Each structure stands twice: as C-alpha cells, then as structure tokens.
Design a protein around this ligand. Structure first.
Ligand SMILES: CC(C)(COP(=O)(O)OP(=O)(O)OC[C@H]1O[C@@H](n2cnc3c(N)ncnc32)[C@H](O)[C@@H]1OP(=O)(O)O)[C@@H](O)C(=O)NCCC(=O)NCCS
Ligand SMILES: CC(C)(COP(=O)(O)OP(=O)(O)OC[C@H]1O[C@@H](n2cnc3c(N)ncnc32)[C@H](O)[C@@H]1OP(=O)(O)O)[C@@H](O)C(=O)NCCC(=O)NCCS
Ligand SMILES: CC(C)(COP(=O)(O)OP(=O)(O)OC[C@H]1O[C@@H](n2cnc3c(N)ncnc32)[C@H](O)[C@@H]1OP(=O)(O)O)[C@@H](O)C(=O)NCCC(=O)NCCS
Ligand SMILES: [Mg+2]
Lengths: 95, 96, 274, 273, 191
C-alpha cells in the first residue's frame, strides 16, 4: 500500500496471514488491533502466539466481559501489556 | 450461568422439598454485548429500565434516534422547568 | 457439389449447429415463433430475449422483469471502469463500435461480475442446505466477502431505490422467491454487523433471476442451473450497460470533447535504477 | 488535497464533462429524470434510451417504435458475418464479452452499415429537392446502388414481414412521414425495373428513424441532423443485434460445440514462387 | 491546484503506478535504459521486449531466442480460428485495428492457449519431483492430455521443422535446459 513520508511516497506491506507478517518483520513488538468486536478476541489470542509482540492495543468497543477476562489471563501469563479494549490508545510525544 | 453469558445470577429463595427443586425468585444480569453469540438462545430478550418514572415523549424520541444509528444520542430530563440546558459533545465532557 | 447435393448423390456433414433463429424461410423465425406472432402476442424486448437466449416463451411477469433489469443496469455514471474507457475512446476520435467494445472489454471480473457471482454464491449456499448464519460464518472462515452485499453510502435506514423498485415487483408478481428469501435473511445478519452491508442491486438481480429461472415453470432444474453456469446473467449486465456506453459515446461526440491525456501528477513512476 | 478541497481553499478543473447520468445523488438520475420517476411514468427500454441517448422525454409512440426496431434487428441467423465470428469465438472457448465483441467488430460497413447509409442517402436526396425519378437516374449515372433497396426473394407481390410490421406502425402513429413517403416513391420506380427491388428493413428503419427524429417534436432540425451524423442509427443496429449475438454465444456453449478449423478445401492458396 | 502543488503546499496521492517507461524526460527511457543506449547497444526487438515486459537487460542469446519465437509464431495459415475471424472482418469492410482485434479475441483457450498451458503443466510436474513416467500415468489417471504433446501429421520419423530449428538454437546457446530435458523424456514415452 502507498503512503506518505512527508511528501515522499513509500510502500507498506499488507499480509493476508499474520504468520507471514511476523516472519518477515521480527523487529515488530507492538500490535495495534482494529479487529471488530466480533473478531477482536480471536485475533488478540492469535497474536499472543508470537512472542515478539509485547504490547497489544485493542481498539474495539463491545467485547463481552467474559472474553476480555480470558485475554487478560493469557496476557498476564505471557507478560504482554494490553492497552484497551475500547480505547483510542495513547501517545508518547517524539516516539 | 457461563453458557448464556450472565454476569449475575441470584435465587433467593431456592426451595428443595421431598418432591424436588423450585426456583421461587430470580434476579439476573447478562452481558448485553454477547448478543452476537447468544441471540439464538436469548431470543427477543428485553432489558427493563429501573423502577421509577416513565420517559417523557422527548426522551423516547432521542432513544429511538440512538438505537437506529452508530452514533450516541442520550437525553434525560432532570427539571423540565430548569433554566440551565446542556448540549454537550462526548460522554466524558457531559459529566464534567 | 451444389448439383450432386440437390440430387442427393452425396452427403457432407454440417460444420455448424444452430437452434435460436431461422432466416431461410418465407418469414423470420425466432426459436420456433414467427416474427409476426412475436408482435401479435406483444412479446416485447423481454419476450424476444426469452426466445433467443433461452428458446422459451416466458410468462409476461418474467419478460417484464427482464426489461426492468435491463433498465436499472442501463447506466451508473462515467466514473465506472467501462464508461471511462468508452469516453476515452470516443474522445480519441473513434467510431461507435470501437468505443463501445473498448468499454465492454472491462466487464467481467472486478467490474460487472457481481450479478453472476452473487447468483452463483447464494445458489450454492442455499442448495447445499446451510442456514443463513452458517453461510455468513463459512464465508468469514474461508476469507471471502459475500457477493451482492455491501454499499458505499446506502444503509438499512437509507435504502437503495433500484433495490426497492425491483424487490417490490418481484414480491408482487413472482409466485415463489425462496432464494430471495434466503438472501434477505443473510442481509439481516450482515446489516446487524455494519449498517451499510445491504443486499445491493447486483445481488438482488442475481437471486431474483435464479428464482425466475427455477420457479417460472418454463425450465427444468438442469436447464436453469446450466443457464446460470454458462453466464446468462453476465449477458444481462452486458446487454443492459451497452445502452449507457452508447449513451456516453454519443454524449462526448455531441459535447465535441477533445483528446484525453492523463496528467503526469497522477502517475507514480517507479522505474529501475540505471 | 481532500481536506483543502473541503475547506474550499483550492480549485482544480475537471478533465471530463458528462450530461447523461448522475450516480452521485441519493437517487440515480437519467438525464434529469430520477430512476423512480422512470418506472412510475412507465418509460420502458425505449423511454430509457430516449433519456440516455437523446436526453429527451419522447412520445410513447416514439418509445414503442424504438423498441420495435430493437426487436426486428435482434437476430438474422448464424450465416451473417458478425454471428459467424461470435460462433467461431464461442467455439474457441472464449467468454461472453470476448465472443460478443469479436462479432460486433464486423458491424460497420458491408455488414450492419445499411441503416445509417440509407438514412443519410435518402435524407441528402430529399433535402436537395430532387424528385424520386431524378434521384434514381442520378445514382445510375454515378454508378451507385440505392442503400436500403433490394431483397434476395421478397418482392412487391411477396412482402417482407419485418418491413410490413414497421411500415404499418409508422403510418398509424407518426404524425408526418415525408422521407418515408419519398423512399416509397423511389421503391415504386425500382420495383418497376426488377420486382425484388423493394424497400428493405434497413432502408425502412433508416428513413422511419429520420422521420421520427425530425417530426416527433422533441428535436430541432439541427439536433435531428446531428444525431444522424454522429451515428445514432448505428447504435440502434449494434444494441439490437447484441441480443442475437449473446443468443448465439449461449447456444454454442449449451450445444457443447468444439473448436472450429476452416476446411482447406474452401481455401484457394495463391502464394508466390 | 497546479500552483499549490508547485509550492508544495498540498499533497495528493497518485491514482496510477508505472515502472516500464518514462516519456517525461529529455530522452525516452525504457526500464531505466535511455532510447539512444538501446540502439547503441544493438538490443533489437527482443532486447526492447526484455526491458518493457520484464524490466531487464537480457543476455544476447535470450533476446535472439525471443525474436526466434516471435518468428515461428508469426503465422500458420488462414484456417485457424483467429485468422478466419480477421479475414471475415476485413472482408466485411472493416479497418485494420477492428479486423486484427476481431481475430485476437479468439486467442486464449482452445486457440493459442497451449504455450502457457504446456509451460505451466511441465513446470508443475518437474518442480513436484515426479519422474517423467509417473507424470505420464498421473495425467492418464486424472483424465488429462499433455499440453504441448501431439501432432496431426508430424511423427518421430517425420519431424516438425519449427521444433527442429528452435531445439537446435536452445541446445547450442542455453547454458542449462533442465525442463526441456524433462519434456523430451516425456516425449520418449508418449511417442
Ligand atoms: C473495530 C472498528 C475500528 C472497525 O469495525 P468495522 O468497520 O465495523 O469492522 P470491519 O471493517 O472489520 O467490518 C465489519 C464486518 O463486516 C464484514 N464485511 C464487510 N464487507 C462484507 C461483505 N461484502 N460481505 C460479508 N461480510 C462483509 C467483515 O468481514 C467484518 O466481519 P467481522 O465483524 O465478523 O470481522 C470499529 O468498530 C470501532 O471504531 N469500534 C469502536
Ligand atoms: C437482360 C437480363 C440479362 C438482365 O436483366 P435484370 O436482372 O432485370 O437486370 P439487371 O441485373 O441489370 O438489374 C435491373 C436494374 O436494377 C438496378 N438495380 C439493382 N439493384 C439496385 C439497387 N439496390 N438500387 C438501385 N438500382 C438497383 C440495376 O442498376 C439495373 O438498372 P438498369 O435496368 O437501369 O440497368 C435478363 O432480364 C434476361 O435474362 N432477360 C431475358 C431476355 C430474353 O428473353 N432473352 C432472349 C432469349 S429468347
Ligand atoms: C486400439 C486401437 C484401435 C486404437 O489405438 P490408438 O489410436 O493408438 O489409441 P488411442 O487413440 O487410445 O491413443 C493412444 C494413447 O495416446 C494417448 N494420448 C493421445 N494424445 C495424447 C496427448 N496429447 N497427451 C498425452 N497422451 C495422449 C492416449 O491417452 C492413449 O493412451 P493409452 O494407450 O494409455 O490409453 C489401435 O491400436 C488398433 O487398431 N490396434 C490393433
Ligand atoms: Mg427474594
């Protein structure tokens, strides 16, 4: 996909499978999850099978409480920081 | 309780006689957001508003607009004869 | 040879086989019906299409429906892939047939494909016996989007007029619409996800057409299923949109529009390093 | 750019110009008329064609006539140049659009051209003020045959049904038919030479269409004459015949017909030495 | 817009992306190579095709081979599906482009498909690791004919000249021909 780095056009890769993205990008440690409330649970659980990912931001508003609890449990036992669900995220100026 | 996504379930009293089990009273809450999973079992489940006065026709109108859109439109009358009216954008700011 | 064949002395097998039209007679014949009968019986474009494409005398509702499809598919502005090419072509000083073909050649996959695709998809799902919710989830799992579902602006509160017009005709005049019923149930599920995930006109025509072939009573199941497969539905879109494209060609000629050259600013040149 | 355009800070001129259809609205618009009105007013294919091709709301008899033309031009067997190519194409395992276009690309001069040609020829002659007999002789002297005159079997005593159907509708519903009248007078002369020199369906449609544009009252002369020139008549034949060609394509696929290879016996090889 | 873009005040993403040719310059550029260099280096039609189609400067043997292919595929009489349509069309009084397209539109499946089909089939079989005899039998079992095998008249005693010409060029100039070797072994079985 074409994007802008100021006024210069750059290309960002788009993957069908998360497995391929992780493999080709070992430098990645953060995942921003825009999955709908229906598929947010499964995609987050899947991400946690890739040890490189240390922080997950869950944007979706509407995940059943019982499911979020299961996400919390797995994240806690794997040491993954979860920001969200139902959040815009956060900001670290300059970073 | 687990299979139907309840968050609260209380039976007071539960009666057990020589004949069997009787559920005399039941108070419960479900996690409404689980509708996409449970629709089949729940059916056309109704969530009653707490006991108190009923909605003015204007409150009912706004409730209808909110239900029919991805946007959040909320309105509750405190004092219809009050001189201070608020039309604030955002759930946080409205409280503030 | 001419003479030997007349006296029946020699036999030579025909290389070609036809069954839609016979121009050899006193009168022109369209699938067994003589041209005078076609007019006398007030068949219309729909009726004539039934004979030439299916070699069948269709019920009046069926003919009227075909005509309705052709009308809603006639045009959809100049921004679409096909219209654009036809306009470019007309502007490059070409004739009607060249300009039309240039545009028609874009029809098939990502442009104009949806009618056929939707009809095929929904038929498969219905016929396989899976319930609408099972279907929705099957597609998600397979990583496929439903063909004939979704709209850019139109939602469950703001309906598509073309879909409204057609739905209402079908409901009123079709004896049975089981596939449409199935599709509308799928729409109930998808709109409950995102409100703009409405059954669009391509999906509506697709399923309605399948219901017309199967339940009008002129075709066997085999016949109805073959017609879908061989791409009769593509024909509807192609014939329909052909009107719009000729429309654009004439328009550009009448508007006396000059040669087009795409602006360089809209082009990203990413050539190899010397 | 998206943002700047929203705040109306910048202007960028359009490279394109349209006037037949507007898909941007809450409703689809065909030449000023919204799609719901199109159906409510019962326009039909003819009516829709009037809006998209001429950007006019035509009289009902004009719409019905256009539909009638599309019906008589729908097909004429598989022996014709275009049908042949579509069949060959379909048989060579191609898709609908490729097969159809392969056939449509033969339309224009010696095949399908006659409607436009007849309309243009007769209009010229009529408008020049020459009487039908003067016209017939002018053509003979110039070594030209009249476009839209002649038939293989059909004669003055044995009429062409397509021509009969159309001729009758036109007389009955058209307010005035001066060009048709002129053409029929030319036919009186040619049939008096050879009986099969009748006004054929291509000639009939051509002159009838000119009479419809000029005398239906929706167009100025300029407008009627521009539409003929830019090839509206070619559009009629192309759109009309497109049905027949799709018919053949489907037929060949349904008939499960194999690849065609022309027999060498039918080819005369006259190569250099 | 023109002005705002010049001063770099606004940005608008390009709708199109190209990488084969750049006409904007002082000189025309074909895949990074300027037109004068194309002629100076004596690329030929084959060479030019390498830049525009693959965006590569191919070896001379490769270019010469591409040109050779184009020459043997040039024509095969008027009886074929495509030629027939073009002739019918030309005879119906049409222009060059209409007549050509009418014929080209038959190319793809049953006519002209074989090149692509054969290459795909043989590559698959070779790459899958199956031996030629296993391949032959696999196809029989699947009810498929081998693409690029068979001739109406030409046999193992009466060879096809076009095949002879090409085989011999390839043998002589291609450093390695493993797939051709595999295919010729399949031919040993079918003949
Ligand atoms: C999470 C968020 C950012 C994105 O949600 P969204 O735009 O509604 O979600 P999507 O773009 O994934 O689309 C919603 C669904 O429509 C489905 N869909 C879209 N087009 C479809 C089509 N033509 N056919 C079938 N399904 C379709 C997608 O598969 C998706 O399914 P899912 O919810 O089971 O994953 C948003 O809800 C938010 O802001 N939340 C707060
Ligand atoms: C004389 C004969 C050979 C040819 O006659 P024919 O077929 O009627 O004549 P043509 O083919 O030239 O056509 C007749 C006319 O139609 C005209 N015509 C044909 N198609 C036309 C068209 N589409 N538009 C305009 N004019 C047309 C021709 O220009 C010709 O005009 P002309 O008479 O002014 O030259 C023929 O009639 C004949 O065999 N006659 C028998 C005579 C006889 O008995 N012989 C003695 C044996 S005992
Ligand atoms: C039996 C007889 C009548 C027919 O034999 P024939 O013409 O040689 O046989 P076929 O037409 O079946 O073709 C021979 C083989 O070529 C194969 N073949 C043909 N074209 C092929 C192609 N393009 N790719 C691969 N295999 C091909 C067929 O699969 C067949 O295989 P098989 O022998 O394992 O069944 C004959 O041998 C006879 O007269 N016998 C005495
Ligand atoms: Mg109690």
């Amino acid at each position: 996909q074409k994007f802008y780095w100021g006024h210069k056009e750059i290309l960002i890769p788009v993957f069908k499978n998360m497995a391929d993205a992780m493999r080709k990008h070992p430098e990645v440690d953060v995942l921003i999850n825009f999955a709908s409330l229906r598929s947010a649970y499964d995609s987050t659980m899947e991400t946690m099978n890739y040890a490189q990912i240390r922080t997950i931001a869950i944007i979706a508003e509407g995940i059943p409480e019982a499911l979020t609890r299961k996400l919390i449990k797995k994240a806690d036992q794997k040491g993954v920081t979860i920001i969200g669900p139902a959040t815009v995220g956060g900001i670290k100026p300059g970073c | 309780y687990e299979d139907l996504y309840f968050t609260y379930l209380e039976i007071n009293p539960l009666v057990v006689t020589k004949d069997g089990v009787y559920v005399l009273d039941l108070a419960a809450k479900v996690d409404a957001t689980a509708d996409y999973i449970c629709k089949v079992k729940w059916g056309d489940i109704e969530f009653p508003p707490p006991f108190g006065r009923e909605a003015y026709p204007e409150e009912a109108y706004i409730a209808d607009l909110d239900a029919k859109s991805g946007a959040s439109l909320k309105l509750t009358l405190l004092n219809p004869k009050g001189r201070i009216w608020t039309m604030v954008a955002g759930g946080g700011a409205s409280v503030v | 040879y001419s003479w030997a064949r007349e006296l029946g002395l020699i036999r030579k097998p025909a290389s070609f086989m036809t069954s839609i039209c016979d121009e050899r007679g006193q009168e022109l014949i369209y699938a067994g019906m003589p041209i005078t009968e076609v007019f006398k019986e007030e068949m219309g474009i729909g009726g004539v299409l039934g004979l030439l494409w299916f070699q069948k005398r269709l019920p009046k509702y069926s003919c009227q429906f075909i005509e309705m499809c052709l009308m809603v598919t006639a045009d959809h502005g100049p921004a679409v892939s096909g219209a654009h090419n036809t306009i470019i072509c007309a502007r490059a000083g070409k004739d009607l047939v060249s300009s039309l073909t240039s545009g028609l050649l874009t029809i098939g996959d990502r442009f104009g494909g949806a009618l056929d695709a939707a009809a095929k998809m929904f038929s498969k799902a219905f016929d396989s016996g899976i319930i609408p919710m099972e279907f929705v989830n099957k597609m998600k799992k397979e990583g496929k989007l439903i063909m004939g579902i979704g709209h850019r602006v139109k939602s469950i509160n703001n309906p598509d007029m073309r879909v409204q017009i057609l739905k209402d005709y079908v409901r009123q005049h079709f004896p049975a619409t089981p596939l449409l019923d199935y599709a509308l149930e799928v729409e109930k599920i998808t709109t409950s996800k995102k409100p703009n995930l409405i059954l669009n006109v391509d999906g509506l025509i697709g399923v309605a057409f399948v219901d017309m072939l199967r339940n009008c009573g002129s075709f066997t199941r085999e016949e109805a299923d073959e017609y879908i497969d061989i791409g009769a539905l593509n024909g509807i879109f192609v014939l329909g949109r052909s009107m719009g494209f000729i429309g654009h060609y004439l328009d550009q000629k009448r508007l006396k529009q000059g040669l087009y050259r795409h602006p360089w600013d809209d082009i990203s040149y990413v050539l190899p390093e010397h």
